[PDB]
Every structure is written in C-alpha cells, then in structure tokens.
C-alpha cells in the first residue's frame, strides 16, 4: 500500500478537488429563491453552467491532461461532464454538503420539468450510491476516472487516455486494500457506478429534448458541451 508516486498523485488530486470553486453567492440561490417549476429550472441551469467551469478547471489540473491531443481534450469533456455532474450532486445528497442545501436542491430537481421515468432511477441511484458511505477521496478519484475514460465516442487516441487513467484506478484500489480490508469487493462497488453513470448519460439526451421543445433556455456553454443544436 502507498508508493511514493501514488501518495504524490493523490494529494495533487485532493488539492484540486477541494479548490472551493462554486461561489456561495450562486449556490445560496438554492435556498432563498422561490420554488416554482420555472425558477427551479433556472437555478438548476445556473448551477450546472457554473459547474461546467469548475469541472474544466479541475480537469485542467489533472496530471498529463494537457499533454493530450486538443481534439481529444474536448471529446472527454463533452462525454464526461454529465457523469461528473451526477457524481457531485450525489456527494451533495449523501454527505449532506452545506453548500448543496440537499433537501431544497432535491425539491428543485423534483419540480423542474423532469419526467418520472428519469426521476425514479435518478434518486434510486443517489440513494444506493450513498449507502456505500464513500469518503471524499473515493468521490474525487471516481470523478477523475470518469473524466479520463477512453471508451467515449469520437475519441481518437484512446491508448494515450488509458495511460493517464491507469495510475488512478491503481491508486483507488490500493486505498480500498488499505482502508477496507474487511471487504475487498469495495473496489468493484466503486467501479460499478461507472456503468450506472453510463445508463444516465444515455438517458440524459432525452431529458434535454423534453426541455428544448418546451422553450427552455440552457446557456451557450451547456449547449456547447452537450451539443444542443
């Protein structure tokens, strides 16, 4: 457990993951603004568009990300932004983060035009992922791993990505062997969510369609990262 190139890799990552990026002025709106279907949708859109920026800074600070091809850098961001967002919001609901305003953030999601088809699996996912009792470390490394996935569509040089991913998947497993000897199936539970996150990625395009046909806004940035025509 714990090599020197791994202990270094982690504290650079947990440094980036803790760079308090979402301004309080913005996130406070989850609390103070009115609770209507329209206002709930704008606030959620505002959170997401700010988070897309937080993710792009975080992904920048990932080891060797800037050594990759420029066309590949976009492909990873476009493919992973949604999964990164499910993960951060999950951390909000599970660890009851004070800047997330969990209960109220849940009320807004639950009344913002999203159909039941997507809401049930969503919070089912949130419920189950929280029962793993993930530590902040486990949350960070999953994000980086989700962002550095070579399986994404439109990716050219996949081996170059897999090279950056491998070190993290290794670090994460060591952490499980160290902090969780009582159950070694913990690494597989963590990796299991990568596939669950994919099912949502696939569904997410439909959610946006439903909104779009209802004259819903989004932002120039969200539209870029998610190819909203």
């Amino acid at each position: 457990e714990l090599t020197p190139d791994q202990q270094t890799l982690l504290h650079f990552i947990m440094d980036s993951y803790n760079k308090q990026r979402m301004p309080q002025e913005i996130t406070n709106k989850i609390l103070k603004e009115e609770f209507s279907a329209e206002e709930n949708f704008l606030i959620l859109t505002e959170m997401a568009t700010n988070h897309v920026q937080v993710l792009v800074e975080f992904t920048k600070k990932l080891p060797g990300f800037q050594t990759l091809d420029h066309e590949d850098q976009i492909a990873l961001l476009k493919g992973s932004a949604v999964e990164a967002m499910f993960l951060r919001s999950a951390e909000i609901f599970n660890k009851k983060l004070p800047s997330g305003h969990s209960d109220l953030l849940e009320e807004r999601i639950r009344n913002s035009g999203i159909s039941d088809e997507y809401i049930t699996p969503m919070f089912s996912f949130y419920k189950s992922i929280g029962e793993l009792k993930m530590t902040q470390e486990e949350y960070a490394l999953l994000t980086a791993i989700v962002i550095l996935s070579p399986d994404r569509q439109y990716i050219k040089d996949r081996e170059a990505v897999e090279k950056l991913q491998e070190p993290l998947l290794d670090v994460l497993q060591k952490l499980c062997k160290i902090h969780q000897p009582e159950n070694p199936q913990h690494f597989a539970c963590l990796l299991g969510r990568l596939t669950e996150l994919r099912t949502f990625n696939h569904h997410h395009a439909e959610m946006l369609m439903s909104w779009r046909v209802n004259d819903h806004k989004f932002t120039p940035l969200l539209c870029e990262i998610w190819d909203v025509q």
């Binding site: 920026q53 792009v56 850098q73 961001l77 476009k78 120039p220 940035l221 870029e224």
Partner: peptide, 11 residues
C-alpha cells in the same frame, strides 16, 4: 467549432 471549451482550456 466548440470555442468556449477551447477558450476555457487555454485560460
């Protein structure tokens, strides 16, 4: 194409 992501990556 995809200019804002480019811009944010180089900022």
């Amino acid at each position: 194409d995809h200019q804002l992501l480019r811009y944010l990556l180089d900022k």
